[PDB]
Amino acid sequence: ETAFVEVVLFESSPSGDYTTHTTGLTGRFSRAGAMLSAEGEIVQMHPLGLCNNNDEEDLYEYGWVGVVKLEQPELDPKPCLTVLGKAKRAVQRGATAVIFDVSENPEAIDQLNQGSEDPLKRPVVYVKGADAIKLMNIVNKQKVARARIQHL
Amino acid sequence: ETAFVEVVLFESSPSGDYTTHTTGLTGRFSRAGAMLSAEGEIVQMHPLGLCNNNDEEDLYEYGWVGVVKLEQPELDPKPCLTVLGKAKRAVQRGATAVIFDVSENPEAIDQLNQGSEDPLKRPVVYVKGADAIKLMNIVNKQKVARARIQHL
């Protein structure tokens, strides 16, 4: 159930070319989703961005990997969707995978694994710890980055 | 060493739903490349376009899955690069994986395995027979398609 995540970050050269930079992180496949690998360009999502008006413009170019840092649970107490619901909505919107940074809402792990009986066909990964920090520092400062999620 | 390939065609709807069609097929990871999963937008290359230097190198956004249908060897007398060279060049040009349809040149399988001692860090996949046909009939109709290459 360990999720080996590779992030390919593109760093602007002074000539305005870009330089590939690869970083390694580790998370866990949630029992809520497939035990499969996935790869695609990272799109950061705010978690309250995964409540549905069901608009066409919400469908990102098929195959993106969504990165969602969960807020402290006493901040969005009337949440549109469960964390599990948010993962599904991400997949409906074209996500090949979702990574949850569960650092500020570690109870979210349990909330996901309760959906274990009807799992998503796509992987749902959670990160925390330094591994979440590394990913978020890439994502916050990274205009374009690509994630490769490898199972085993 | 079996590569499980899914080719997903996709279409945004005004209704706010992705419509998808997934075709499943089987190929093999060459020893020429990493034994790793990979996923990205499919780009069809004519095998001659994996030749000359640097004009077309950044044509395609990093992360694409190259589909190259080989020609019979005698058609291509003076080959700019070996089939192995062609695979390496695709990866220099951003490819996250390469799929060769080796139907018209099955000696390519042996050529690729010659580079087994110094494999690429990205997977190099081949298909033939009915698997190659399904793949090519989707790729030739020139819509946008994602390929998912699952190692086991």
Give one DSSP letter per residue of B68-119, joined into a string. EEPPPGGG-SS-SS-HHHHHHHHHHTT-SEEEEE-TT-THHHHHHHHGGGS-
Euclidean distance between CA atoms A81 and B85, whole angstroms: 50
Contact at CB, A56 and B151, closer than 8 angstroms: no
Segment B73-82 long-range contacts (CB within 8 Å, at least 24 positions apart): B73/B105, B73/B107, B76/B47, B76/B48, B80/B48, B80/B50, B80/B51, B80/B52, B81/B50, B81/B51, B82/B111
Q: Cβ atoms within 10 A of the Cβ of B64, count? A: 22
For residue A9, the chain B residue with the least C-alpha distance is B62
Longest dimension (CA), chain B: 52
State this model's resolution in angstroms. Answer: 2.0
List all residues 6 or more positions away from B56 whose beta carbon is below 8 Å from its beta carbon: B49, B93
Say which amino acid occupies A98.
V
CA distance B29 to B116: 11
Cα distance between residue A84 and residue A89, in whole Å: 9
Instruction: Identify the bridge partners of residue A23 per DSSP, sorted by sequence position.
Output: A7
CA angle A65, A69, A73 (to 5 degrees): 140
Which residues share a beta bridge with A78? none
Distance from CA of A144 to the nearest CA of B (A): 10
Q: A56, B148: Cβ pair inside 8 Å? A: no
Measured CA distances, B115 to A14, B108, B130 (Å)? 36, 12, 26
Q: How far apart are CA B29 and CA A16, in angstroms?
A: 36
Domain boundaries, chain B: 1-152
Q: How many residues does chain A have?
A: 152
Which residues does B55 contact at the CB level (< 8 Å), separation at least 6?
A: none
Give the whole-angstrom CA distance, residue B1 versus residue A145. Answer: 29
Q: How many Cα atoms are found within 13 Å in the side-chain-facing hemisphere of B65?
A: 28
Q: Six-digit token pair at A37?
A: 């690998």
- Three-class secondary structure of residue B39 per DSSP: strand
Torsion angle (degrees, nearest 10) of CA B79, B86, B3, A152: 150
CATH class name, domain A1-152:
alpha beta
